[PDB]
Design a protein around this motif. Sequence first.
Motif, PDB file in Angstrom:
ATOM      1  N   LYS A   1     -11.412  -0.878  12.072  1.00  0.00           N
ATOM      2  CA  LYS A   1     -12.115  -2.083  12.488  1.00  0.00           C
ATOM      3  C   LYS A   1     -12.042  -2.277  13.996  1.00  0.00           C
TER       4      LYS A   1
ATOM      5  N   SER B   1       0.821  -1.207   0.000  1.00  0.00           N
ATOM      6  CA  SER B   1       0.000   0.000   0.000  1.00  0.00           C
ATOM      7  C   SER B   1       0.857   1.260   0.000  1.00  0.00           C
TER       8      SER B   1
ATOM      9  N   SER C   1     -10.522   0.567   4.693  1.00  0.00           N
ATOM     10  CA  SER C   1     -10.494  -0.019   6.032  1.00  0.00           C
ATOM     11  C   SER C   1      -9.185  -0.782   6.185  1.00  0.00           C
TER      12      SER C   1
ATOM     13  N   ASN D   1      -2.931  -5.970  10.771  1.00  0.00           N
ATOM     14  CA  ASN D   1      -1.479  -6.027  10.726  1.00  0.00           C
ATOM     15  C   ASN D   1      -1.007  -5.839   9.292  1.00  0.00           C
TER      16      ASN D   1
ATOM     17  N   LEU E   1       0.665  -6.650   5.961  1.00  0.00           N
ATOM     18  CA  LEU E   1       0.888  -7.879   5.198  1.00  0.00           C
ATOM     19  C   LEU E   1       0.469  -9.110   5.997  1.00  0.00           C
TER      20      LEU E   1
ATOM     21  N   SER F   1      -2.715  -9.086  -1.948  1.00  0.00           N
ATOM     22  CA  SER F   1      -3.252 -10.412  -2.218  1.00  0.00           C
ATOM     23  C   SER F   1      -3.649 -10.530  -3.684  1.00  0.00           C
TER      24      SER F   1
ATOM     25  N   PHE G   1     -16.373  -4.267   4.000  1.00  0.00           N
ATOM     26  CA  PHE G   1     -17.486  -3.392   4.338  1.00  0.00           C
ATOM     27  C   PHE G   1     -18.467  -3.367   3.175  1.00  0.00           C
TER      28      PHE G   1
ATOM     29  N   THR H   1     -14.542  -3.710  -2.775  1.00  0.00           N
ATOM     30  CA  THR H   1     -15.836  -3.076  -2.532  1.00  0.00           C
ATOM     31  C   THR H   1     -15.837  -1.618  -2.973  1.00  0.00           C
TER      32      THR H   1
END
Lengths: 223, 230
Positions: free
Chosen positions: B78, B23, B41, B45, B47, B209, B163, B191
Motif C-alpha cells: 500500500k 498471520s 496486501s 502496522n 495488529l 479482526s 483491494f 476479498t
Amino acid sequence: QKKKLKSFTNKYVVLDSLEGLRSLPDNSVQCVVTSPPYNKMNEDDYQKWQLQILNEINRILKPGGSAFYNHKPPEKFLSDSDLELYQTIIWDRGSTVNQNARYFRPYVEKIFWFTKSISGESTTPKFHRDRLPEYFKGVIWRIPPDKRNKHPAPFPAILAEICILTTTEEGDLVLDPFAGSGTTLVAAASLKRSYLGFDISSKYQKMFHQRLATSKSKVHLWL
Amino acid sequence: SNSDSFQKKKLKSFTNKYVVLDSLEGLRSLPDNSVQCVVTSPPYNKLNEDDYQKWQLQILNEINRILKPGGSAFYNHKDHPPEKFLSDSDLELYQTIIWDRGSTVNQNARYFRPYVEKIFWFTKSISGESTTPKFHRDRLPEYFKGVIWRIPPDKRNKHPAPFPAILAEICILTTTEEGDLVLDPFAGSGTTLVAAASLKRSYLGFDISSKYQKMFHQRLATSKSKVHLW
Ligand SMILES: Nc1ncnc2c1ncn2[C@@H]1O[C@H](C[C@@H](N)CC[C@H](N)C(=O)O)[C@@H](O)[C@H]1O
Ligand SMILES: Nc1ncnc2c1ncn2[C@@H]1O[C@H](C[C@@H](N)CC[C@H](N)C(=O)O)[C@@H](O)[C@H]1O
C-alpha cells in the motif's frame, strides 16, 4: 571547475561519465536526465560504479535540483547513494515485441526521480506540474518509442522535455552523463535551457552534432 | 513427525475458512508445499521501520515454505523503498505489476499524481534455486495481459483499505486450477477469499479482526458468486 563550467556549457563532451562528473563544481547542475548503459559486467562491479555516478550527481546538483534516471532489484542498491529517491515514475511504452507468455507483457520502464540531499537532510525538488498538459501530470507517462532515432537504445525527446520543463527555468544547466544520441541535450536546447552531455562515443557525439543541424528546433510538449 | 501431523490437521480444519489468528502463527500452522496462490496486501502496522521489515521478512519466508513449487504470491504494498528488504526474503521476486487505480484524491502538486500501487509477484525458491510459476495468461481478457492493470477501487467494500475482487480474480485464475488452495494471510474484508470461492478454488484467510471475519461471512452470504472478470 567553475571556470571549466563556462567552457562546458552547451557542449557534447566525449569523456568517461565519472571523469566528467568529477570535473563539474558543486551545486552547478539544476536537472539531470539520463538512461545509463548496461556496461562501460559483474553485478557488484556495476552497482558500485553506478553508485559513484549517483553520489557525484548528488554533489553536482543544485539544492532543489532533480535527477531523472531511466533504468532497464534496482532499488536495492539505489537506496545506498547520497541521492534521495523522491518518486518512481512509470514509463508506459505502449507496446512490446516481447510477447512471451511466462509473465505479463513488459512494456513498462522505471524513471527514478532523485533529489539532492544536503548533509543527510531531504530537500524538496523545484517542480512545476502546472507546466504540463493533463496527459502527463500523473505518475504514468504513455510515451511510445522514437523510431527515427539512430541510437540503439534511446529515449524520446518528449520524455526529457517533461523532466526539464517541470524542474528548470530558461538558462539552467541540464546534464546527461550518458548522452548517446543527445536526446536530453536536444530537448534542453529546444526549451532554451543550457545543456551538457558526456559519452565515450565520438560516433554518438557526431550523431548529436548532425541531429542538431538537420532538424528544426521543435518542442513536443503542448499547452 | 509431530509437526507434520499438526500442520496437516490444521490445514484440514482451516480449509475454506476465515480464521481469526495472528498471520505468522497461522502461516506456521500450514504444511510445506500446501498453497498454490497467495494474494495479500499487508497492513501498515502489525495488529518502527526496522521492526516492520523484520516482521514482513518472516511472513514472506513462511510463505515461501508453504507455497507449492510453481506457486505464486501476489503482494500488494500500500501507498527505504520496499524492494530493499523484499529481496532479502527466501521468495524470488518474479515481476512487479503496476496497479493503476485510475485516480487519486491526493492532488498535491509536489509530485506526479500518485495513483499507482505495486503488486509484487513472487515465486517459490527451492534450495536457493528459482522455480517457474504456473501461469496461464490466455485466461485473461486482453485488457489484463499487460504489466499495468487499470482497476478502479471497489466502492461498496466496507473495509477501510481493501483491494478489488477483480484484482484477486486475475491473480487466482492465471495461477490455479479449480480446487487449489488460495491464501490471504491479511484477509481483511475477505476479498481474496470471495474471489477464490467464485472461481471454485479453495480458500483460507487469516486476520486478527473478528469484525472483519464477520464482514466476510455476511459479504459471502449476500454475494451471488459473480465473477468480475467474466
Ligand atoms: N563509461 C561510460 N562513460 C560514459 N558514457 C558511457 C559509458 N559507457 C557507455 N556510455 C554511453 O552510455 C550511453 C547509454 C545510452 N543508452 C543512452 C542513450 C540516450 N538516452 C539517447 O537518447 O541516445 C551509450 O551511448 C554509451 O555510449
Ligand atoms: N498481526 C496481524 N495478523 C493478521 N492480520 C493482521 C495483523 N495486523 C493487521 N492485520 C489485518 O491486516 C489487514 C490488512 C488489510 N488492508 C487487507 C484488506 C484486504 N485486502 C481486503 O480486501 O479487505 C487488516 O484487515 C488488519 O486487520
